[PDB]
Amino acid sequence: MDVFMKGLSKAKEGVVAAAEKTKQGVAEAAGKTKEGVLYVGSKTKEGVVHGVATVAEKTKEQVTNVGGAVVTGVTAVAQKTVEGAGSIAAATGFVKKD
Amino acid sequence: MDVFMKGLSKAKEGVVAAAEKTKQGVAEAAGKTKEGVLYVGSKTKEGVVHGVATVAEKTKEQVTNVGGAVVTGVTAVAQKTVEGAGSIAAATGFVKKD
Amino acid sequence: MDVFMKGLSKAKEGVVAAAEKTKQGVAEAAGKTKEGVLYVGSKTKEGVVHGVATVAEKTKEQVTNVGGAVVTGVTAVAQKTVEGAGSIAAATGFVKKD
Amino acid sequence: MDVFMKGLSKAKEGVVAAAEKTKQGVAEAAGKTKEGVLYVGSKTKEGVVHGVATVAEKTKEQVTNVGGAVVTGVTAVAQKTVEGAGSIAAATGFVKKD
Amino acid sequence: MDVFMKGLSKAKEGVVAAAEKTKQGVAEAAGKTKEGVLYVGSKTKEGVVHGVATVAEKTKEQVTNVGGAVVTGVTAVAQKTVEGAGSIAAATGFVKKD
Amino acid sequence: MDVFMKGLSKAKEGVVAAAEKTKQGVAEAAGKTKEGVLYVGSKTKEGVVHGVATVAEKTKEQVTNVGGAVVTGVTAVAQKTVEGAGSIAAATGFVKKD
Amino acid sequence: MDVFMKGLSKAKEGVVAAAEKTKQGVAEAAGKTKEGVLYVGSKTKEGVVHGVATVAEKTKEQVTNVGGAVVTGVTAVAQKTVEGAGSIAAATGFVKKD
Amino acid sequence: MDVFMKGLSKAKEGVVAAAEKTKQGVAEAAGKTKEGVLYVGSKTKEGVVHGVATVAEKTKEQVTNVGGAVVTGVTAVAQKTVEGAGSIAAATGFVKKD
Amino acid sequence: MDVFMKGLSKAKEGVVAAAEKTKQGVAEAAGKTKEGVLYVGSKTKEGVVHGVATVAEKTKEQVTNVGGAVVTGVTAVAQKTVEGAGSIAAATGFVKKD
Amino acid sequence: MDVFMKGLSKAKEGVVAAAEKTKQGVAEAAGKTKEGVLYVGSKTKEGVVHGVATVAEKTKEQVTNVGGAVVTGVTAVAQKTVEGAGSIAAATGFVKKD
Amino acid sequence: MDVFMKGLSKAKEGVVAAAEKTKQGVAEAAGKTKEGVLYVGSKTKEGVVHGVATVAEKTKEQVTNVGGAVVTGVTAVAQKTVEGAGSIAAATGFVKKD
Amino acid sequence: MDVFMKGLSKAKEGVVAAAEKTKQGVAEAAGKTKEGVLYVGSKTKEGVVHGVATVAEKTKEQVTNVGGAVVTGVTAVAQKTVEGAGSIAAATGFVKKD
Ligand SMILES: Cc1cc2nc(/C=C/c3ccc(O)c(Br)c3)sc2cc1N(C)CCOCCF
Ligand SMILES: Cc1cc2nc(/C=C/c3ccc(O)c(Br)c3)sc2cc1N(C)CCOCCF
Ligand SMILES: Cc1cc2nc(/C=C/c3ccc(O)c(Br)c3)sc2cc1N(C)CCOCCF
Ligand SMILES: Cc1cc2nc(/C=C/c3ccc(O)c(Br)c3)sc2cc1N(C)CCOCCF
Ligand SMILES: Cc1cc2nc(/C=C/c3ccc(O)c(Br)c3)sc2cc1N(C)CCOCCF
Ligand SMILES: Cc1cc2nc(/C=C/c3ccc(O)c(Br)c3)sc2cc1N(C)CCOCCF
Ligand SMILES: Cc1cc2nc(/C=C/c3ccc(O)c(Br)c3)sc2cc1N(C)CCOCCF
Ligand SMILES: Cc1cc2nc(/C=C/c3ccc(O)c(Br)c3)sc2cc1N(C)CCOCCF
Ligand SMILES: Cc1cc2nc(/C=C/c3ccc(O)c(Br)c3)sc2cc1N(C)CCOCCF
Ligand SMILES: Cc1cc2nc(/C=C/c3ccc(O)c(Br)c3)sc2cc1N(C)CCOCCF
Ligand SMILES: Cc1cc2nc(/C=C/c3ccc(O)c(Br)c3)sc2cc1N(C)CCOCCF
Ligand SMILES: Cc1cc2nc(/C=C/c3ccc(O)c(Br)c3)sc2cc1N(C)CCOCCF
Ligand SMILES: Cc1cc2nc(/C=C/c3ccc(O)c(Br)c3)sc2cc1N(C)CCOCCF
Ligand SMILES: Cc1cc2nc(/C=C/c3ccc(O)c(Br)c3)sc2cc1N(C)CCOCCF
Ligand SMILES: Cc1cc2nc(/C=C/c3ccc(O)c(Br)c3)sc2cc1N(C)CCOCCF
């Protein structure tokens, strides 16, 4: 079970170059992410919200937030004359300069 | 079971160049993502919202949010004279410069 | 079971160049995504909303949101003189410059 | 079962160049996506909304949203003098410059 | 079962160049998408809305939305002097420049 | 069962160039899409809306939306002096320049 | 691809009885047999005889045998008052004896 | 790919009875057999005889045998008052004796 | 890939009875057999005889045997008042004797 | 990949009875056998005979045997008043004797 | 990968009875056997005979045997008033004797 | 990877009875056997005979045996009034005798 590979796997005489993701000026809020996850015979239970109650009576204002991730604010990014955020990959092999 | 591969897998004499995603000026809010997920014989239960109640009586205002991810705000990005966020991949092999 | 591959798989003498996605000035809100997901004999249950109640009586205002992901706000992006977010892949092999 | 491949699969002497998607100035809201998903003998249940009730009585206003993803706001993108977001793939092989 | 392929599959001496989709100035709202999905012996149940009730009595206003994805807002894109978002693929092989 | 292929499949000595879709100034709302979907012995049930009730009595206004995807808003795109979003594919092989 | 079946296949309410071959007093010599063979995308090479030489000079006797199976002898069977070698299959269902 | 089955396959309410082969007084010599063989994407090479030489000179006798299976002898069977070698299969179901 | 099955496979409410082969008074010599063999992506090479030489000169007798299996002798069976070698299978289900 | 099964596989409410092979008075010599063999991505090389030489000169007798299995003798069986060698399988279920 | 099973596999409410092989009065010589063998990604090399030489000169007698298994003798079995060698399997379940 | 099982595997409410092989009056000589062998990513080399030489000159007699297993003798069995060698398996469950 060879699952996640970046290169030579049961191979011969390879020249591999692999880059990866970049981010420049990103503002995320309450996000989830799974990159390269492998379950084998497992049993999970993720991110549930259960049994929520909320009562109001003769009140003038009520603001409630329930969740896995609550974001109530400013998530700002400001850039100016920003230069260079990149993943470079170079590979060279089996050269015969004679 | 060879599942996720980037390169040579049971091969010979390869020249492979692989790049990857980029992001420049992205604003995400309450997003989910799964990249390269593999389940084998597993049993999961993800992201459920169950049994929510909300009562109001003679109240003047009631604002409620329930969820897996609640975002109530500003998620802003501002760029100016920003330059360069990219994934480059170069590969070279089996060259005979004589 | 060779599922996800980018390159040579049971091959010989290949020159492969693969790029990937780009994003420049993207604003997503409460989105889902699955890229390269493989289930084998698994059993899942994702993203359900069950048993929601909401009562109002003699109230002047009631604003409720229930869901897997609730976004109530501004998700803005502003760019100006932004240059370059791209994935490049170059491959070269089996050259005989004599 | 060779399912997703980008390159040489049980082949010989190939020169392959593959690009990928691009995005420039995109605003998505509450979207779903599946790219490269493979189920084998699995059993799923995704994105259901079940058993929702909503009562009003003598109230002056009631605004409710239930769903898998609720977006109530502004998802804007603004670009100006933005240049370059593209995936390039170049491949060259088996050249005999004599 | 060779399902999704981009290149040489059980072949010899190929020169393949494949591009991919582009997007420039796109505003999607509550859309679904499936690109490259393969089920084998699986059983699914996606996107159902079941058992919804809504009662009003002597109320002055009631606005309700139920669904798999509810979007109540502005999803706008504005571009000006934007240049270049395209996927290019070039391939060259078996050249004999003598 | 060779289902989806772009290139050489059980072939020899091919020069293939394939492009892909483009989008420039597109505004979609609550759309579905399936590109390259393959079911084998599977059983699905997608996008159903079942058992919806709605009662009004002596109320002054009631606006309800139920569905798989509800979009109640503005999905606008505005472009000006935008240039270039296209997928190009070039292939060249078996050239004998002597 | 349902290939070899003995019974109910995607059916309901069946009563099936299947017998099979018998042999009583059989003498086989250098025989081949294939019962229920299925090739899928395979490549075989069975039972070849290649490059055989035989030289004699001033010899008084030369007896040579080459082959996939050489039988030079007695393969005899003798029976007397032998009784019973048969495959019986009985099936009974959905009987309502009242 | 449901290949070899003896019974119910994706069925309901079946009564199946299957017998199998019998042998009584059998003498085989240098025989081959394949019952229920399935190749998928495999490559084999079975039972070859290659490059055989045989020289005689002034000899009085030469007896040679080459092959996959050489049998030079007696393979005899003798029976007398032998009784009973058979495969029986009985099945009974869904009987309502009232 | 459900390949070899004897009973219920993805079924309900079955009554299955399966017998199997019998042998009484059998004499085999240098035989091969394959029952229920499954290759997947494998590569084999079975039973070859290669490069055999045999020289005689002024000799009075030469007896040679080469092969995968050489049997030079007596393989005899003798029975007398032998009784009973059979495979029986009985199945009974869903009986309502009231 | 459910390959070899004898009973219920992904089923419900089954009554299965399976017997198996029998042997009474069997004499085998230099035989091969494979029952229930499964290769996955493997590479084998079984039973080869390679590079055999044999020289005689002025000799009076030469008897040589080369092979995977050489049997030069008596393989005899003698029975008298032998009784009973059989595989029986009985199954009973879901009986309601009232 | 559920390969070899005798009973219930991912099932419910089963009554299974399985017998197995028998032998009474068997004489085997230099036989091979494989029952329930599973290779995964393995590489083997079994039973080879390579580089055999044999020279005679002015000798009166020469008897040579080379192989994987050499049997030069008597392998005899003698029975008289022998009774009973069989595999029985009985199963009973879900009986309601009231 | 559930490979060899005799009973309930991921099941419920089973009544399983399994017997096994028997032997009565068996004489084996230089036999091999593999029952329930599983290789994973292994590499073996079993039972080879390599580089054998044998020279005779003016000798009166020469008897040589080379192999993996050499048996030169008597392997006899004699029975008389022998009774009973069998594997029995009985199972009973979920009985409601009221
Ligand atoms: C596609 C292919 C692929 C291929 N791959 C080999 C060895 C790989 C290797 C060998 C050793 C290693 O260690 C590793 Br890693 C990897 S031969 C071969 C042949 C082919 N064809 C389609 C040839 C068809 O035409 C016949 C000749 F014209
Ligand atoms: C011509 C060219 C030009 C070029 N320019 C770049 C800017 C990078 C950067 C510049 C500034 C930054 O801040 C960052 Br981060 C990154 S990539 C690139 C690629 C290419 N090719 C297609 C060459 C083909 O290769 C031959 C293979 F055989
Ligand atoms: C002509 C060219 C020009 C070119 N220019 C780029 C800008 C990159 C960049 C520039 C500024 C940045 O900030 C960043 Br990030 C990235 S890619 C590119 C590719 C090409 N080709 C098609 C060459 C074909 O290759 C021959 C293969 F055989
Ligand atoms: C040409 C070819 C070449 C080829 N090469 C392999 C490497 C195996 C390996 C195995 C183990 C290792 O360690 C190494 Br290195 C390498 S499989 C294979 C298959 C093929 N075909 C023509 C399959 C066409 O039909 C497919 C049906 F879909
Ligand atoms: C002529 C050309 C011109 C060209 N120009 C680009 C701009 C890139 C860029 C420029 C600025 C950026 O900021 C970024 Br990011 C990226 S791609 C490109 C491709 C081509 N071809 C079709 C060459 C064919 O290749 C021969 C294969 F055999
Ligand atoms: C082609 C394709 C290619 C493809 N490639 C992936 C990468 C996965 C990966 C993910 C993570 C990793 O680490 C690695 Br390595 C690899 S998904 C995918 C889906 C597809 N289709 C369904 C479209 C069919 O094309 C038509 C051809 F005619
Ligand atoms: C495909 C399928 C799949 C399936 N999967 C189950 C249990 C999974 C599980 C249960 C528990 C677990 O822990 C795990 Br892991 C996994 S029942 C079932 C039924 C079916 N069908 C009837 C489909 C018939 O389509 C024919 C049209 F083509
Ligand atoms: C459908 C299929 C499915 C399939 N699944 C495998 C799993 C291997 C594995 C190998 C090792 C592991 O550890 C695991 Br987990 C799993 S091979 C395979 C082959 C096929 N076909 C040939 C179908 C072609 O016929 C369509 C006609 F309808
Ligand atoms: C089927 C096949 C299979 C195959 N397997 C190899 C190496 C295996 C290995 C090599 C080394 C190892 O260590 C191991 Br484990 C395993 S080459 C090869 C070639 C072929 N074909 C020609 C098939 C042509 O038809 C396809 C569609 F019809
Ligand atoms: C039917 C069958 C049944 C069968 N059963 C086996 C047991 C394996 C085992 C071996 C060891 C164990 O421990 C266990 Br549990 C289990 S091989 C085999 C082969 C076959 N065929 C090729 C004939 C196809 O039938 C026609 C139907 F229409
Ligand atoms: C009826 C049925 C029923 C069924 N039941 C399963 C158990 C899964 C399980 C999975 C994990 C566990 O832990 C347990 Br317990 C149990 S698969 C399955 C498939 C089917 N079909 C109709 C498939 C027909 O098409 C096949 C194409 F060939
Ligand atoms: C009538 C009968 C008689 C009968 N007699 C045997 C001898 C066994 C033996 C006797 C002596 C031995 O040494 C050995 Br080992 C074995 S099997 C047999 C089967 C049957 N039927 C067809 C009954 C049908 O079943 C109803 C299903 F619904
Ligand atoms: C009637 C009968 C008789 C019978 N007799 C045997 C001898 C065994 C033995 C006798 C002596 C031995 O030494 C040895 Br070992 C073994 S099996 C047999 C089976 C049957 N049936 C077909 C009954 C049907 O079942 C109803 C299912 F619903
Ligand atoms: C075949 C089948 C199988 C099946 N298996 C279940 C639960 C198993 C289990 C449940 C829980 C466990 O813990 C274990 Br272990 C095992 S329901 C079910 C229904 C069916 N059918 C209706 C198929 C009808 O044929 C299709 C068309 F012909
Ligand atoms: C009738 C019968 C008779 C019978 N007799 C035997 C001799 C055993 C033995 C006798 C002596 C020994 O030395 C040895 Br070891 C072993 S098995 C057998 C089976 C049966 N049936 C078919 C009963 C059906 O069951 C109902 C299920 F629902």
The rounded distance, in Å, linking the Cα atoms of C71 and A30 is 10
Strands H46-52 and G46-52 turn out to be: parallel
Q: φ and ψ at B53, to 5 degrees? A: -130, 155
Taking CA atoms, H25 is separated from H28, I78, K25, in Å, by 10, 10, 15
**Are the beta carbons of H23 and I23 closer than 8 angstroms?**
yes
**Are the beta carbons of J63 and K62 closer than 8 angstroms?**
yes
One-letter amino acid at C9 equals S
Both structure tokens of C4: 């996800």
Provide residues of J within 8 Å CB-CB of chain L. 7-8, 42, 59, 69-70, 85, 87, 93
HSE-CB at L86 with a 13 A cutoff on CA atoms is 21
HSE-CB at K57 with a 13 A cutoff on CA atoms is 5
Displacement of CA E6 from its chain's centroid (Å): 18
Q: φ and ψ at I49, to 5 degrees? A: -130, 120
Per CB-CB distance under 8 Å, the chain J contacts of K33 are 32-33
- Residue J81, classified by CB atoms within 10 Å of its CB into exposed (0-12), middle (13-18) or buried (19+), is middle
Taking CA atoms, I73 is separated from I70, J32, K65, K72, in Å, by 10, 18, 14, 9
The rounded distance, in Å, linking the Cα atoms of D44 and C43 is 6
Both structure tokens of B80: 């100016």
The neighbouring-strand residues paired with C67 are: B67, D67
**Closest-CA residue to J24 (of L22, I24, I75):** I24
One-letter amino acid at J89 equals A
- Buried b vs exposed e over D8-38: b needs ≥16 C-beta within 10 Å? bbbbbbbbbbbbbbbbbbbbbbbbbbbbbbb
- Residue F81, classified by CB atoms within 10 Å of its CB into exposed (0-12), middle (13-18) or buried (19+), is exposed
**Are the beta carbons of H68 and I68 closer than 8 angstroms?**
yes
The rounded distance, in Å, linking the Cα atoms of I72 and I49 is 19
Strands E34-40 and I70-71 turn out to be: unpaired
Query: Could you tell me the distance, in angstroms and rounded to a whole number, from the CA of residue B86 to the centre of ligand 2?
Result: 9
**Are the beta carbons of C72 and C4 closer than 8 angstroms?**
no
- Nearest bound ligand to the CA of residue A87: 2
Cα Rg of chain G (Å, integer): 25
The rounded distance, in Å, linking the Cα atoms of B34 and A45 is 16
HSE-CB at L27 with a 13 A cutoff on CA atoms is 25
One-letter amino acid at E11 equals A
Give just the sign of the alpha carbon dihedral I21, I22, I25, I30. positive
What is the length of chain L?
98
The rounded distance, in Å, linking the Cα atoms of H58 and H42 is 49
One-letter amino acid at F15 equals V
- Buried b vs exposed e over A8-45: b needs ≥16 C-beta within 10 Å? bbebebbbbbbbebbebbbbbbbbbeeeeebbeeeeee
**Are the beta carbons of C66 and E67 closer than 8 angstroms?**
no
The rounded distance, in Å, linking the Cα atoms of C97 and F86 is 34
The rounded distance, in Å, linking the Cα atoms of C71 and E80 is 28
One-letter amino acid at H77 equals V
The rounded distance, in Å, linking the Cα atoms of E15 and D93 is 9
What is the length of chain E?
98
The neighbouring-strand residues paired with L71 are: K71
Q: What is the 3-state secondary structure (H, E, C) of chain I?
A: CCCEEEEEECCEEEEEEECCCCCEEEEEECCCCEEEEEEECCECCEEEEEEECCECCCCCCEEEEEECCEECCEEEEECCCCECCCCEEEEEEEECCC
* Beta carbons within 10 angstroms of residue J7's beta carbon: 36
The rounded distance, in Å, linking the Cα atoms of I70 and J31 is 10
Q: φ and ψ at L97, to 5 degrees? A: -90, 105
Any binding-site annotation on K50?
Answer: yes
DSSP D60: S
Q: φ and ψ at B80, to 5 degrees? A: -160, 120
What is the length of chain B?
98
- Nearest protein CA to atom 6 of ligand 9, as residue: I43
**Closest-CA residue to B52 (of E67, C54, D71):** C54
Both structure tokens of A72: 């109530």
Chains G and K touch (3+ CB pairs under 8 A): no
The rounded distance, in Å, linking the Cα atoms of H49 and J50 is 10
* Beta carbons within 10 angstroms of residue K43's beta carbon: 17
One-letter amino acid at A1 equals M
Break sites following residues in chain A (C–N > 2.5 A):
none
Taking CA atoms, J8 is separated from H17, I13, L25, in Å, by 16, 10, 35
The rounded distance, in Å, linking the Cα atoms of A16 and A31 is 32
3-state secondary structure of J74: strand
Query: Could you tell me the distance, in angstroms and rounded to a whole number, from the CA of residue H11 to the centre of ligand 8?
Result: 22
**Closest-CA residue to C30 (of E77, B28, F71):** B28
CA distance from start to end of chain G: 43
**Closest-CA residue to D54 (of C68, F71, E52):** E52
The rounded distance, in Å, linking the Cα atoms of H16 and K18 is 16
Displacement of CA H42 from its chain's centroid (Å): 22
The rounded distance, in Å, linking the Cα atoms of B69 and B28 is 12
The rounded distance, in Å, linking the Cα atoms of E46 and D48 is 7
DSSP F83: B
- Residue B98, classified by CB atoms within 10 Å of its CB into exposed (0-12), middle (13-18) or buried (19+), is exposed
One-letter amino acid at K93 equals G
Query: Could you tell me the distance, in angstroms and rounded to a whole number, from the CA of residue C42 to the centre of ligand 13?
Result: 44
Taking CA atoms, D5 is separated from B7, E8, H41, in Å, by 11, 9, 17
The rounded distance, in Å, linking the Cα atoms of K94 and A38 is 40
**Are the beta carbons of C39 and D40 closer than 8 angstroms?**
yes
The rounded distance, in Å, linking the Cα atoms of J21 and L20 is 11
3-state secondary structure of D22: coil
Both structure tokens of H18: 């299957």
Both structure tokens of D32: 């779903």
The neighbouring-strand residues paired with E76 are: D76, F76
**Closest-CA residue to C88 (of A88, D88, A17):** D88
What is Dmax (Cα atoms) for chain I?
91
**Closest-CA residue to C18 (of E58, D87, D94, F14):** D87
Q: φ and ψ at L71, to 5 degrees? A: -125, 115
Both structure tokens of H60: 């009085």
Both structure tokens of B36: 């390269």
* Beta carbons within 10 angstroms of residue I22's beta carbon: 31
One-letter amino acid at D93 equals G
Q: Which residue has the tokens 């089954």?
A: J14
The H or E element containing residue C65 is strand C62-67
The rounded distance, in Å, linking the Cα atoms of H15 and I12 is 11
Taking CA atoms, D92 is separated from B25, C87, D14, F91, in Å, by 33, 18, 10, 10
Give just the sign of the alpha carbon dihedral A29, A31, A35, A38. positive
Both structure tokens of C75: 């998700």
The rounded distance, in Å, linking the Cα atoms of I17 and B74 is 69
The rounded distance, in Å, linking the Cα atoms of B29 and B67 is 13
3-state secondary structure of G37: strand
3-state secondary structure of G82: coil
Name the residue among L1, L17, L98 with its Cβ closest to that of K90: L17
CA distance from start to end of chain J: 43
Taking CA atoms, H67 is separated from B42, C28, F55, G5, G69, in Å, by 52, 72, 89, 36, 5
The rounded distance, in Å, linking the Cα atoms of G10 and G25 is 40
**Closest-CA residue to J19 (of G18, H18, H8, G36):** H18
Strand segments (E) across chain D: 4-9, 12-18, 24-29, 34-40, 46-52, 62-67, 70-71, 74-78, 88-95
The rounded distance, in Å, linking the Cα atoms of H25 and H78 is 8
- Nearest bound ligand to the CA of residue I24: 12
The H or E element containing residue C16 is strand C12-18
One-letter amino acid at J9 equals S
The rounded distance, in Å, linking the Cα atoms of A8 and I88 is 55
**Closest-CA residue to E95 (of D97, F91, B14, D11):** D97
The rounded distance, in Å, linking the Cα atoms of E74 and F75 is 6
Q: What is the 3-state secondary structure (H, E, C) of F34-46?
A: EEEEEEECCECCE
Total H helices, total E strands in chain F: 0, 9
Resolution of this PDB entry, in A?
A: 2.9
Displacement of CA C48 from its chain's centroid (Å): 20
Query: Could you tell me the distance, in angstroms and rounded to a whole number, from the CA of residue J11 to the centre of ligand 10?
Result: 18
Contacts (Cβ under 8 Å, ≥6 apart) of I4: H3, H4, H36, I36, I38, J3, J4, J5, J36
The whole-angstrom distance between C47's CA and the closest CA on chain B is 5
Both structure tokens of D38: 């493979």
**Closest-CA residue to E91 (of F6, F58, C32):** F6
**Closest-CA residue to I55 (of H53, K49, H49, J58):** H53
Residue I88 beta carbon below 6 angstroms from any ligand 15 atom: yes
**Are the beta carbons of F84 and E83 closer than 8 angstroms?**
yes
The H or E element containing residue A12 is strand A12-18
Both structure tokens of D16: 């392959």
Q: φ and ψ at D21, to 5 degrees? A: -65, 160
**Are the beta carbons of I29 and I75 closer than 8 angstroms?**
yes
3-state secondary structure of C84: coil
The rounded distance, in Å, linking the Cα atoms of L94 and C64 is 53
Per CB-CB distance under 8 Å, the chain E contacts of D11 are 7-12, 14
3-state secondary structure of D83: strand
Q: φ and ψ at G20, to 5 degrees? A: -150, 175
One-letter amino acid at B84 equals G
Any binding-site annotation on I98?
Answer: no
**Closest-CA residue to H59 (of L17, K74, G57, E3):** G57
Displacement of CA F90 from its chain's centroid (Å): 25
Contacts (Cβ under 8 Å, ≥6 apart) of G91: G15, G16, G17, H15, H16, H17, H90, H91, H92
Q: Which of B2, B10, B23, B24 to mutate to test the interface with D (most CBs of D within 10 A)?
A: B24
Provide residues of J within 8 Å CB-CB of chain H. 11, 15-16, 19, 22, 24, 30, 39, 56, 67
The rounded distance, in Å, linking the Cα atoms of C12 and B94 is 13
The rounded distance, in Å, linking the Cα atoms of D71 and D68 is 10
Q: Collect contacts of G63-67 with beta carbons under 8 A, ≥24 apart.
A: G63/H62, G63/H63, G63/H64, G64/H54, G64/H62, G64/H63, G64/H64, G64/H65, G64/H66, G65/H64, G65/H65, G65/H66, G65/H67, G65/H70, G66/H49, G66/H52, G66/H65, G66/H66, G66/H67, G67/G30, G67/H49, G67/H66, G67/H67, G67/H68
DSSP K41: S
Contacts (Cβ under 8 Å, ≥6 apart) of F49: E48, E49, E50, F66, F67, F68
- Buried b vs exposed e over F34-64: b needs ≥16 C-beta within 10 Å? eeeebebbbeeebbebeebeeebeebeebeb
Give the atom of ligand 15 at the shortest distance from the alpha carbon of L86: 15
